Write a protein that binds this ligand. Sequence first.
Ligand SMILES: NC(=O)C1=CN([C@@H]2O[C@H](COP(=O)(O)OP(=O)(O)OC[C@H]3O[C@@H](n4cnc5c(N)ncnc54)[C@H](O)[C@@H]3O)[C@@H](O)[C@H]2O)C=CC1
Ligand SMILES: NC(=O)C1=CN([C@@H]2O[C@H](COP(=O)(O)OP(=O)(O)OC[C@H]3O[C@@H](n4cnc5c(N)ncnc54)[C@H](O)[C@@H]3O)[C@@H](O)[C@H]2O)C=CC1
Lengths: 331, 331
Amino acid sequence: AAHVLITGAAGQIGYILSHWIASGELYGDRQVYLHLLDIPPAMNRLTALTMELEDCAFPHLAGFVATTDPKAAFKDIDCAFLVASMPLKPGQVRADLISSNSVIFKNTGEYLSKWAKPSVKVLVIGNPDNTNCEIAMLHAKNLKPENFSSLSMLDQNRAYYEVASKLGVDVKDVHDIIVWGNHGESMVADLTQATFTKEGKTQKVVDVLDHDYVFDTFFKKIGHRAWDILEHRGFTSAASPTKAAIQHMKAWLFGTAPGEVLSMGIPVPEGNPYGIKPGVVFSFPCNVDKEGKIHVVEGFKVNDWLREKLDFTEKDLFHEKEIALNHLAQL
Amino acid sequence: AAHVLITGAAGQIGYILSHWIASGELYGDRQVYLHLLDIPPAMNRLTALTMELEDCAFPHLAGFVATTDPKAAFKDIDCAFLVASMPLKPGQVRADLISSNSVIFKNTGEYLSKWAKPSVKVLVIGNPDNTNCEIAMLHAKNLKPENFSSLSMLDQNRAYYEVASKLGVDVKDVHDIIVWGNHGESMVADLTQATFTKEGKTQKVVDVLDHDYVFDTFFKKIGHRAWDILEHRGFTSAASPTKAAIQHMKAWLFGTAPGEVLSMGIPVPEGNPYGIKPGVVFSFPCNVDKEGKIHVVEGFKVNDWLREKLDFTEKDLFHEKEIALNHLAQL
Ligand SMILES: NC(=O)C1=CN([C@@H]2O[C@H](COP(=O)(O)OP(=O)(O)OC[C@H]3O[C@@H](n4cnc5c(N)ncnc54)[C@H](O)[C@@H]3O)[C@@H](O)[C@H]2O)C=CC1
Ligand SMILES: NC(=O)C1=CN([C@@H]2O[C@H](COP(=O)(O)OP(=O)(O)OC[C@H]3O[C@@H](n4cnc5c(N)ncnc54)[C@H](O)[C@@H]3O)[C@@H](O)[C@H]2O)C=CC1
């Protein structure tokens, strides 16, 4: 009954994402109808995808449609995973995709506004996803900022596992790790809020791990992680962001758990308590109520170190916006 | 607590299989410890795999070990997914991999016998999997035939979806479709047993779909399916067999549901009711009791058509065994 869209479905992420969702991991007992969008030169792998979906005999898959037509893909969808993208060339960073992906998400915003449900929940994955989310949201007349978000939970999950290994505890035993701002080079892996509990006793991460590790070694490691996977894999990540994206969407759809804080790129809400200026999509510490509305988690402290990092990634986001939107105007 | 082995983990199937299992889809609430085996020239992607597993922050993943050392991979494992294989060249069929994969599974059988638990459940995926399963089982002194099985459920799931589309019902509404014998060119997609129910009324498939479709069009389609995916994907299937393999193993571990029949390649049991001779691994209609023991489902009818098909694929299996084991002897 639930209609889920996946753009760039024929790609590496779309391949796994479609199967995992069809398995019933997103909507549980409720069936899913997959809208699979891609482009004609990828029509082969797109068909290859559907055939394998068919070959799973998923009882949670009510049906699907694989197309290159926007309308067929976006019509009356309940949520969307925007994974569409051109190839990231060797040696490039996420921001280098602005020139080739900006138009895609400009059009996507229009498609969403034109055909998707007003309650559509759009999760942007394709890089630069914070920016691409800004593009789509801007060019969606009939939709609001609350309909859009970008994926930063891969960064948080990276941070969670890393910190967990150094503290000698499980991931579930750590709390309030946050990745602020852009899912890019300037991402801010923040541990100044973080705590962990072991055998009844709670400790602050900064009081247990040395300064040099927390603010340099760790900070660098999380930012560079995506390229470390690329070095060993020969391609950027795929299975891990798929997991983060399903985790992200599921929380967005049905709400978060007690004490759960998720790094979610959202259009900067006016009156946010962390001094970030509106105009971009910014990763905040977020929760989601049982009616599916994201809320920035209040109460976290911003010392001089974090303030500077937030300013840097904020400046970075507004810069990407300048370059991206200017490219569209001339385009 | 449950230790799961995956050979050829760095490959396409091992990539998805590892993540999906780590998600908790195999052992549910019980944690999993992944033994990830591959070869040094694939050490890069093997590390790339672990990094992404780490980057998921799976709460069901207790830990893992990625190695090229047999002992570290096979020690005290509870079950194994044998996916290890050399590349399948263009234009080849599954049986063409005998020359390059036979030794792998000869050694694997020895590793299993030497280090794995006596209760280990070994699922063979790497092609030719029926044969490769025969190789491993033969060269495992301390283990029994009941410890080994090969994957044919991808064929059944293919058959189920196909038949479902033509009957205008869901997959869950169809029953007793079977794929007998070899997971190869000679595979027998049998619908002579099949039925389906719609709105209280049950019908036999052969009484609803025309003869020409059932015994020619359908029979050919399921056999050729693997190469049809290859045509469109550029590689053989990966996500769909991963699903079938997890489905297969889960049923093998915790038993099947009422009326559920699964095509499972097992060492031909002496005294099977369908006249198949011992000495090979043969796909039978199977169920599994709540203590995890596979049983060939009795009661199915074998008309002249099926008998001939069974003889052909049986002959095919004994032929593959001749070629494979002879290659090992000279090797
Ligand atoms: N947010 C995150 O944490 C992560 C994001 N990514 C990003 O995800 C994106 C895709 O990753 P992969 O699946 O590995 O790449 P891929 O190249 O395998 O897939 C991209 C797909 O988008 C399609 N596409 C291109 N233009 C399109 C258009 N106008 N409309 C519809 N579809 C179109 C292509 O045909 C292709 O199938 C990349 O931009 C990458 O940077 C990758 C890893 C993690
Ligand atoms: N049963 C079924 O329904 C299906 C079976 N397959 C079979 O699965 C096998 C693998 O498929 P893919 O993952 O796509 O292939 P792949 O080539 O991506 O992966 C095979 C992996 O096995 C590894 N390997 C090779 N020799 C080894 C050894 N001695 N020990 C440990 N690892 C070794 C390789 O390094 C490689 O990473 C193939 O033989 C293919 O025919 C494929 C599709 C469906």
